[PDB]
Design a protein around this nucleic acid. Structure first.
Lengths: 129, 88, 123
RNA sequence: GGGAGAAGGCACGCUGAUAUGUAGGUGAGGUCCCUCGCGGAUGGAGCUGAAAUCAGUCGAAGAUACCAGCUGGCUGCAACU
RNA sequence: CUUACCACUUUGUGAUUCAUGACUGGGGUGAAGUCGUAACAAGGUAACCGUAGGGGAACCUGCGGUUGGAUCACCUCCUUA
RNA sequence: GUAAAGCGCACGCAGGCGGUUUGUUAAGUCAGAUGUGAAAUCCCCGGGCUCAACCUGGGAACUGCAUCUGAUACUGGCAAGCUUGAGUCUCGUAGAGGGGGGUAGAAUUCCAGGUGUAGCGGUGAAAUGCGUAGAGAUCUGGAGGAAUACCGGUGGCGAAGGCGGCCCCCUGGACGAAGACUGACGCUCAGGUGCGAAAGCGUGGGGAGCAAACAGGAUUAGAUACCCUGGUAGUCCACGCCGUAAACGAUGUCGACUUGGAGGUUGUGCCCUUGAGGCGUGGCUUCCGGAGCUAACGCGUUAAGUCGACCGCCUGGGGAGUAC
RNA sequence: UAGCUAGUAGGUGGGGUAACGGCUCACCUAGGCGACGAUCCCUAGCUGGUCUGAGAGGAUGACCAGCCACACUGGAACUGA
C-alpha cells in the first residue's frame, strides 16, 4: 500500500528529473498542489495543471538549465511516524540557504525564507536543493 | 465456490431489492454459506491442508468485513449476526 | 533499524570490561611474592624473562613481571605492582615497580632512570 | 495419577451472649385451589439443631481416659495388587 | 497485676548465590610427539547442509537437498557438416 | 546476495503507519502571554586584586513544565461523502495445486511348468556367489509390491517445503474481457495459532526394487572406506509426535516510480486474419544489457536503482549455536 | 525473574492525626496491579553541577549548594512548636 503519497510525489520528481522527462504525472491532492506551487514560485519546476477533476491528476513540467537537471536532489523529512517539527528560530537552513525547506505552517505551505520573515514555525516537509 | 443458483438466492435475501453484489452483509452471508459447505468437506477430508488455507482465508476475510460493519451501522451488524446465526 | 523497533528494545553500547582484573581498579597494589620464576616467552622471541608470582593485599594472586637487567627479589618479599600487559609471557598483565617497597631498584641505569628507580648520580 | 497424612505448626474443656437454641432440617392447626382428598398452594406452631466468633472462668495438663501413623536421608533386589 | 501489639531469641522447611570436592566431560595453548592423510586442484570417491547408523580418528555410509561444483558445453549442417 | 546479518513459509490479535473531499473540533503542532525553572559553578559585556588563577556587578541561559489567548497548513479526533485502493458478482481459460477411491501397460522379482547345456555373474583384472541336485538364456501361466517410460520444455501449478500414468468424486488459488455493486473494509505484525523435503519416531499393516547396520570377497603398508556378491531396519500405506535443511534467488513483506532488446507461456482486441505472417492489450516467466548502485563480482523495470511504511536480524575471530 | 496481592482492592460506619486517607478496626463486597514489564533478584543516596564531546550523546554526583537518610546494632516512647 502506498503509505505516504507526498513521499511518492517527490520521488516521481527525482526519478523524472534523473531520466530527462519533460513532464511528471500523479494523482493530486490539495497538499500536492500547494507543494508544487512553492516549487513553481521558487523556480525548481516550470508549471503545473490539475486536470481530470472527476478523479484528479496533477501534471507538472521539469526544468533543465542547460543539459543538467535543475533540482540537485530533493528529500522528504516529515516522513510518516517521524514527523519532524521545528520552532520559528530553529527553522533549518538547507545548503547555506541556497536550498529550501518546504514548511507547512499555519499560514500555509511555504518556503523557509518567507516563513522566517513571518516568524512562524511548523512541520518541515521536504528539503530541496 | 457456492452454487450459482444458490448464490442468486443468497444475494436476493441478504441484499436489498436493488440486488447488490458488494454490500457488506451480502459478502458475509456468501462467505458464511461457503464456510458451512466447506465445513462438511473437511469432515471427510481431514488431511487436506492446501484447501484448508483457503478456508482460513474465507474466515479471516469475514472477520474483517464484520469489523467494518460494526464500525458503521451497529444496528445492521447486531441484526446480521443473529440472522446468520454467528457465535454464541 | 526502524525507529519504532529501537523504541521497543534500545541500542546498547558495547559491553565494557578492563584488561586489568585484580588491582582494585586503582593504579598500584602491594603484595608479597609467593614464588619467583624464570620463564620462556611465546614463539618469535627467544629469551629467558624474569617473573614473580605475587599475592596481592586484596587476596587475588597474580603473576607480575620484574623489569630491568638485575633484580634482588626473593620469595616472600613485599613488592608494589602496576598494570602492564607483557605481550610475550602467557598471563602476565602486571609489572613490579622497581623503586618501591622491598623491590630495591635497578643499579646503574643512566638513561631511563625514573622508570625502575635510580637516584641521580651527581646529587 | 503421585510423592502427601511429606515435613511443620496453631486451635480444641466448661459457661454466657450474638440466638432466654442461631443457621439448617422437620412442617401443626390455619388460610386458599381444584380433576375434589393417601391431593396442591399455603402460612409457620410445637419439634430437633450443626458450627463460629466474642466475652468470662477452672486445672500442672481440655484429642485429658479407652481408642486413634515414629519420622526423614542414601541405596541393592523385584514394575506394582 | 493484667490482656493487646513488638525487638532480640528460638525451631522447622525451601529457594538463591558464593566457596568447595574424590572424580570426570568438553574447550584453549605449547621452537619440527605417535597414527592416518579429512579439506583446499571437481585434492586423486565433487564438496557442503540436514537427520539416522557405524568406526581409533580425521571420517565413511544410506536417504533427501543445494552450487557456495564446473569437464570439446549433443539436435537435424545431412550440400559444404 | 556473497563480508556478521531476512525469521523455512503463512494467517493474524495487541501495536506502528493510513487514498481522497468537505465540514468541524483544536489533541499533537506553531506563535504570543504569564507563573515557574533558587544561588554562585557555564556564557557575553564590565569592575577589582600589579597580571593570572581568583573574587565580583548586569544580561543571557535553565532547550522543560504549567495555564490563558490565538492560528488552521499539517497529522489526530468526530460527522457526512467520493472512488483509482481493497473487496464482490456473472461468463470463460490454463495447470503434475490439494484430498479420497478405482484402473491399465512395460519392467525388475518370486513360485509353478516346458525346452535346453555348461558355465553364469562380476571387474581394471579378479574373487566371494549361483551352476552338472540342471544354472544362465528361452517360452507359457500365476503371484505380489513399488514406480508410472515417451509426452517433459528456460515449461506449468503452488504461501513455502513441494507436486508428473489414466479415470471419476469433493475442493483451493490465480488470470482475463466487458458490465455492475459496496465505499478505505488498507499495508505490516511482537506474542500467538497454523502448514515439513528428509532421515528419525510410536502403534498397526506391507515388503517387488533399492539399501545404512551387517557379512563375505578385493585393492591397500592398513583400509572399519572406494569396487564387487549378498542383506536388515528403512523407504510404501493408515494414524499420531519433535517441525530440521546449502527450508535459497544465500535477496522479508506490500506499494509507487525509472530507456530497452531477444525468448518461453497463457487470457485477449483488430486483419484479403492469407509468408509457423502484420498491428493492439493484460497476467506470469527467462537469457541479455543501459542509467544508476555496489568494495568487487554483479544486480539492473521480477533491482542489488529512486523511495514510502511495518517487522526480523547483526556488532571481530576462536569458545558457541555449546553450557547452565 | 511472568504472574504478584488479600487490610490487598473498593464501600459503609466507628476509632485515630494537626490533617486527608484501610491510618486502624468490625462488618462487608470482590476486586487492585501486571508484558506501557508488576513481582523477584543485583547494584545505587538524589540533584543543581562536574568531566568529556563540534553538537546530540556518553560517563559521573569530589568540592559549593538544596533535599533525603543514618548516629555503636536492633527496637520504643517521652518531653516539646
Amino acid at each position: 500500500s502506498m503509505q505516504d503519497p507526498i513521499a511518492d510525489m517527490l520521488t516521481r520528481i527525482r526519478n523524472g528529473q534523473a531520466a530527462n522527462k519533460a513532464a511528471v504525472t500523479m494523482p493530486s491532492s490539495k497538499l500536492k498542489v500547494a507543494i508544487a506551487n512553492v516549487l513553481k514560485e521558487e523556480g525548481f519546476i516550470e508549471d503545473f495543471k490539475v486536470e481530470g477533476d472527476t478523479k484528479p491528476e496533477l501534471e507538472l513540467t521539469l526544468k533543465y538549465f542547460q543539459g543538467k537537471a535543475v533540482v540537485e536532489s530533493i528529500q522528504r523529512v516529515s516522513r510518516p511516524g517521524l514527523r519532524i517539527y521545528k520552532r520559528k528560530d530553529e527553522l533549518p537552513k538547507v545548503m547555506a540557504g541556497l536550498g529550501i525547506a518546504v514548511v507547512s505552517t499555519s499560514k500555509g505551505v511555504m518556503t523557509d525564507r518567507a516563513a522566517r520573515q513571518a516568524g512562524l514555525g511548523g512541520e518541515i516537509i521536504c528539503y530541496v536543493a | 465456490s457456492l452454487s450459482t443458483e444458490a448464490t442468486a438466492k443468497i444475494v436476493s435475501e441478504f441484499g436489498r431489492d436493488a440486488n447488490d453484489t458488494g454490500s457488506t452483509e451480502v459478502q458475509v452471508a456468501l462467505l458464511t454459506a461457503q464456510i458451512n459447505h466447506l465445513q462438511g468437506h473437511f469432515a471427510e477430508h481431514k488431511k487436506d491442508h492446501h484447501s484448508r488455507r483457503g478456508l482460513l482465508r474465507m474466515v479471516s476475510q469475514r472477520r474483517k468485513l464484520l469489523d467494518y460493519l460494526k464500525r458503521k451501522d451497529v444496528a445492521r451488524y447486531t441484526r446480521l449476526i443473529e440472522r446468520l446465526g454467528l457465535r454464541r | 533499524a526502524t525507529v519504532n523497533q529501537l523504541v521497543r528494545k534500545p541500542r546498547a553500547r558495547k559491553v565494557a570490561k578492563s584488561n586489568v582484573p585484580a588491582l582494585e581498579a586503582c593504579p598500584q597494589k602491594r603484595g608479597v611474592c609467593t614464588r619467583v620464576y624464570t620463564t620462556t616467552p611465546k614463539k618469535p622471541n627467544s629469551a629467558l624473562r624474569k617473573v614473580c608470582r605475587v599475592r596481592l593485599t586484596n587476596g587475588f594472586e597474580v603473576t607480575s613481571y620484574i623489569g630491568g637487567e638485575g633484580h634482588n627479589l626473593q620469595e616472600h618479599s613485599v613488592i608494589l605492582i602496576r598494570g602492564g600487559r607483557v605481550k610475550d609471557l602467557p598471563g602476565v598483565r602486571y609489572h613490579t615497580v622497581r623503586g618501591a617497597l622491598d623491590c630495591s631498584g635497578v643499579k646503574d641505569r643512566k638513561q631511563a632512570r625514573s622508570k625502575y628507580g635510580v637516584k641521580r648520580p651527581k646529587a
